[PDB]
Amino acid sequence: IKIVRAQRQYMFDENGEQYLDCINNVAHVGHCHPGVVKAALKQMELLNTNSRFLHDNIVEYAKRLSATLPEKLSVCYFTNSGSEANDLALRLARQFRGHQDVITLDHAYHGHLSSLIEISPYKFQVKKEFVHVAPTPDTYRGKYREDHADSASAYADEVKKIIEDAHNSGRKIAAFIAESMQSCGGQIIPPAGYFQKVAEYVHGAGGVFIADEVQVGFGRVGKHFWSFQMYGEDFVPDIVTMGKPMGNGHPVACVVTTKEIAEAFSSSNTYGGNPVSCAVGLAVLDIIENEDLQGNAKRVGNYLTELLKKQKAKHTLIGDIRGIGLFIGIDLVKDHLKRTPATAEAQHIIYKMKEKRVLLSADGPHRNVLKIKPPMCFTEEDAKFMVDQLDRILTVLEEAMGTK
Amino acid sequence: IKIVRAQRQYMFDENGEQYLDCINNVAHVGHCHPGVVKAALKQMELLNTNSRFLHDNIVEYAKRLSATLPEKLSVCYFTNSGSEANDLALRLARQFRGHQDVITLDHAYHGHLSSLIEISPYKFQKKEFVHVAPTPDTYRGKYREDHADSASAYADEVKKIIEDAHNSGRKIAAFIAESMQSCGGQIIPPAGYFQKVAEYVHGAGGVFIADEVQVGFGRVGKHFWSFQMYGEDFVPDIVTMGKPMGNGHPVACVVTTKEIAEAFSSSNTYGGNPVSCAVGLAVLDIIENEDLQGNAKRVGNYLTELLKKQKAKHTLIGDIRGIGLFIGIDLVKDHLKRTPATAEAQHIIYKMKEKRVLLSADGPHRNVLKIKPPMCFTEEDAKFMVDQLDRILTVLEEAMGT
Ligand SMILES: Cc1ncc(COP(=O)(O)O)c(CN)c1O
Ligand SMILES: Cc1ncc(COP(=O)(O)O)c(CN)c1O
Numbered sequence A: 001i002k003i004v005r006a007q008r009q010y011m012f013d014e015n016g017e018q019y020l021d022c023i024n025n026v027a028h029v030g031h032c033h034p035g036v037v038k039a040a041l042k043q044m045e046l047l048n049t050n051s052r053f054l055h056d057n058i059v060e061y062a063k064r065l066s067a068t069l070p071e072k073l074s075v076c077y078f079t080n081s082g083s084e085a086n087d088l089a090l091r092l093a094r095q096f097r098g099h100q101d102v103i104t105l106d107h108a109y110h111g112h113l114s115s116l117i118e119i120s121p122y123k124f125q126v127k128k129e130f131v132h133v134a135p136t137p138d139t140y141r142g143k144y145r146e147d148h149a150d151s152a153s154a155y156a157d158e159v160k161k162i163i164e165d166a167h168n169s170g171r172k173i174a175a176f177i178a179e180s181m182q183s184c185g186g187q188i189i190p191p192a193g194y195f196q197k198v199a200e201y202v203h204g205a206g207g208v209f210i211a212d213e214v215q216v217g218f219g220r221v222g223k224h225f226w227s228f229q230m231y232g233e234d235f236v237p238d239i240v241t242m243g244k245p246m247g248n249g250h251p252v253a254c255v256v257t258t259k260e261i262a263e264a265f266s267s268s269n270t271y272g273g274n275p276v277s278c279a280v281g282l283a284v285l286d287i288i289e290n291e292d293l294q295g296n297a298k299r300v301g302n303y304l305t306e307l308l309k310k311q312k313a314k315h316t317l318i319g320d321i322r323g324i325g326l327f328i329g330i331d332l333v334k335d336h337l338k339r340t341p342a343t344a345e346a347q348h349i350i351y352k353m354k355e356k357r358v359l360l361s362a363d364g365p366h367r368n369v370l371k372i373k374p375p376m377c378f379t380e381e382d383a384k385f386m387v388d389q390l391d392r393i394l395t396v397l398e399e400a401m402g403t404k
Numbered sequence B: 001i002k003i004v005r006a007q008r009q010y011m012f013d014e015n016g017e018q019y020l021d022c023i024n025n026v027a028h029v030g031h032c033h034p035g036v037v038k039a040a041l042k043q044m045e046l047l048n049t050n051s052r053f054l055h056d057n058i059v060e061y062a063k064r065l066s067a068t069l070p071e072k073l074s075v076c077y078f079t080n081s082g083s084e085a086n087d088l089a090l091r092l093a094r095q096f097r098g099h100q101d102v103i104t105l106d107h108a109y110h111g112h113l114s115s116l117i118e119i120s121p122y123k124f125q126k127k128e129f130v131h132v133a134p135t136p137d138t139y140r141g142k143y144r145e146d147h148a149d150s151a152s153a154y155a156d157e158v159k160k161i162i163e164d165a166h167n168s169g170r171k172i173a174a175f176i177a178e179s180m181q182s183c184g185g186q187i188i189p190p191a192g193y194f195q196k197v198a199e200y201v202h203g204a205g206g207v208f209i210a211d212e213v214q215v216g217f218g219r220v221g222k223h224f225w226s227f228q229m230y231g232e233d234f235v236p237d238i239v240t241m242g243k244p245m246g247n248g249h250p251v252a253c254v255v256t257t258k259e260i261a262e263a264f265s266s267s268n269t270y271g272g273n274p275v276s277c278a279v280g281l282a283v284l285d286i287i288e289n290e291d292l293q294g295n296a297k298r299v300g301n302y303l304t305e306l307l308k309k310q311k312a313k314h315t316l317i318g319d320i321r322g323i324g325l326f327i328g329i330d331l332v333k334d335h336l337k338r339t340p341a342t343a344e345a346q347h348i349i350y351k352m353k354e355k356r357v358l359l360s361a362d363g364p365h366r367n368v369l370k371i372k373p374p375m376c377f378t379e380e381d382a383k384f385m386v387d388q389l390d391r392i393l394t395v396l397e398e399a400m401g402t
Helices: A034-044 A056-067 A082-097 A151-168 A194-204 A227-231 A259-266 A275-290 A293-314 A343-355 A380-401 B034-044 B056-067 B082-097 B150-167 B193-203 B226-230 B258-265 B274-289 B292-313 B342-354 B379-400
Strands: A003-007 A010-013 A018-021 A075-079 A101-105 A131-134 A173-179 A208-212 A239-242 A253-257 A318-324 A327-332 A361-363 A369-372 B003-007 B010-013 B018-021 B075-079 B101-105 B130-133 B172-178 B207-211 B238-241 B252-256 B317-323 B326-331 B360-362 B368-371
Touching: A018 A380, A034 A275, A034 B034, A056 A075, A056 A253, A056 A275, A075 A082, A075 A259, A082 A173, A082 A208, A082 A239, A082 A253, A082 A259, A082 B082, A101 A151, A131 A151, A151 A173, A151 A194, A173 A194, A194 A208, A194 A227, A253 A259, A275 A293, A293 A318, A293 A327, A293 A380, A327 A343, A343 A361, A343 A369, A343 A380, B018 B379, B034 B274, B056 B075, B056 B252, B056 B274, B075 B082, B075 B258, B082 B101, B082 B172, B082 B207, B082 B238, B082 B252, B082 B258, B101 B150, B130 B150, B150 B172, B150 B193, B172 B193, B193 B207, B193 B226, B252 B258, B274 B292, B292 B317, B292 B326, B292 B379, B326 B342, B342 B360, B342 B368, B342 B379
Parallel strands: A101 A131, A101 A173, A173 A208, A208 A239, B101 B130, B101 B172, B172 B207, B207 B238
Antiparallel strands: A003 A010, A010 A018, A075 A253, A239 A253, A318 A327, A327 A369, A361 A369, B003 B010, B010 B018, B075 B252, B238 B252, B317 B326, B326 B368, B360 B368
């Protein structure tokens, strides 16, 4: 299985055999997009050296990013990775008032650096006194499920209790950080109202809200540019992080914050940005705009959701279809009474889908949630093909399991 | 103000005025090198997706890097920055035996991430698990050129840190040093210092991290790696490298031993990127094809001789130090105390910039003129830079002496 070439939503092995890419969201506008390559080439022939001479590309990119965000999110710091962006977000939050503690979600994954291992319970084998883990707002397998009267308040009340317990111990809260939807956690979309209530409680403790959009930003949710905007025009994080999807896979990432948080940081340029990275970033924003990729994600996402609802109706292995736009999870279960993760069945389905040249993966803490997050040029034809291959595989698998 | 174009060792403003770049060592083989651009373009039109399909570029690059290093340094982890490489080096060290403490040098700078602030005393306006050893600076440090054996006296400081830590029931993961300090003001430790430190750290179960992020890839002229200036028998356990390896593209690497890698794998983020490895291979090919290591040796030796004559003529020059195209000019108000000439250095940078030479001043007192250009820097560039410096120092010392 040796991939050597990729174009748009497809990958090719050394025999030129075509594979449907449902995995590499980082190739956000499509693999080897000529418009991105051209932007990179033009800037690489001129200048690849950082803004001690505040370069037109960097100024224009930061203005264009800021234009996609709420009013108060106006100051851009450029980094080389989603992980660097998250590390900077924790420093901006901790420097803001000198509070040290960070509240994170169960099964969160924020990146692979030292500072991020500490706040990424997905990767806990050693848990620090300055990190608190709130129950993940998962209404399928979490502490409060779809039958609860008000899971958004019940989950948000868990954060308020962490805050009260920390205050009672004389500790202070720098930040609450959440993936706007959890990737590794298994495609978790928090309930309506949850983030807004959490932000209110964190603001009461002098903390800030960090929204990690590293996986879910740039129009993937179809209905908005930013996954956090799902929660209404009145939900505004204090810090937003973004990763390599913004560069179509080039090492570029960004943190956007408020004047107030930036000024505290200034009181004690590495984050000025790179001309080539900003040329690539601008070409990505232009392509999302010119090719209606946010609209594509909305339409193809709605089509995928409808196909998968019909798959759920005839396949008992399907416990839950969740997601929005081109961010979808298919939660596979051994039984509906207990929602027991179908880990071994998920691994088998990925192997069988790969034999039919569909590339996907399984996440969630039990590795049972099939993940769909393709390059944004994924078509209804690609969606139908993928689901046709899945239907066949599920039918054969459930007939085998159901055999005396 | 205002650079829009750069080629080789030169930068150009929007009027096409030419500037001599003595600053951007990250453009290691020269700004916008066509052979690096060509290699990036070819790979970017094919595949930019990480080795879940262990890519020929990544395998070939890691083999080529490993070939430039001592035998035991054979396992490559790829990252996006020098900072990411240093963060990974600390995790490799701490995971190796579960020791937590890191010994760093005074005035060290290892990067801008959380984990690196803690071990970068250049940026302290310290954690219990960080110990700061006196920097082995024979011009302004604790032990100077008149000491009988400064390499032993500096190494003995690390032994004492190790003993005090052990006595408190603490354990040492690592000793980390820039092979030559950049921010610290172009500091070349004495012969024997690193080898003695490595023996002491090895006795504590610790590992030696050599940070080559600024000083690697043939810059020292006499060797490929700055650490090899301490002899074929000095071998770090972990070596970090940064964006110079990609001519300024975000690529960086950690190389360690099988033993350290196996302890780490007991718990492909670091598999590398096809485009990054294509750029990396083009950089290695250019250093080889253009004899850039040889250029750094020859032009470096010429620069040193020019600057030795400037020192004889100019009392503001306290110390000329460096090797190849890593040079510091330590400016002093007086020789009795070696008082840093901070205000004079700022003035000299401003005047050199008016003559279209770009340099900077580091050291903890910002008095050390730094020369670390792209590696294609010529003897003609060296003569020009020094000619402009001579004139500026003559005018400045005549003014001060009225
Ligand atoms: C939420 C989140 N944050 C950060 C990262 C880090 O990615 P990168 O290599 O660009 O640091 C990832 C994916 N690795 C992620 O899913
Ligand atoms: C010794 C050293 N290490 C690491 C870095 C980090 O550079 P970056 O992480 O952006 O590539 C620097 C640059 N100041 C450095 O001088």
